[PDB]
């Protein structure tokens, strides 16, 4: 395997810990990082 | 909306269009090009 970067077609297993709400914690999605407390949310996303 | 996100990684330069020949023979069809800029 070549790990020059590239687009990465092969990636190994990434790790998601349970996800917690309603209390502040350092939070990553797919490699959005942020700082806050998550809560149910009425806003209506789009699916994509 | 987005359909798909593709990793192909090669370079496009041409394009061509695919027209299916139903039970050759086809019936008349309206397409349009237009180009991004």
Same mark, same amino acid.
Not at chain 1, 2 to 15: D, F, M, Q, S, W
Not at chain 2, 9 to 35: D, E, K, P, S
């Given at each position: +395997?070549?790990?020059?970067? !590239? @687009? /990465? &077609? %092969? =990636? *190994? @297993?990434?790790?998601? #810990? ?5 209390? =502040? %914690?350092? +939070? ?5 990082? *942020? &700082? *806050? %407390? ?6 209506? +996303?789009? @699916?994509? | 909306? @987005? ?9 496009? #330069?041409? +394009? ?8 050759? #023979?086809?019936?008349? /069809? !309206? $397409? $349009?090009?237009? $180009?991004?800029?």
């Amino acid at each position: +395997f070549e790990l020059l970067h !590239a @687009p /990465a &077609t %092969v =990636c *190994g @297993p990434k790790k998601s #810990t349970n996800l917690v709400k309603n209390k =502040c %914690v350092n +939070f990553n999605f797919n490699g959005l990082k *942020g &700082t *806050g %407390v998550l809560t149910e949310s009425n806003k209506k +996303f789009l @699916p994509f | 909306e @987005p359909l798909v996100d593709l990793p192909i990684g090669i370079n496009i #330069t041409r +394009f061509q269009t695919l027209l299916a020949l139903h039970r050759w #023979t086809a019936g008349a /069809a !309206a $397409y $349009y090009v237009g $180009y991004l800029q």
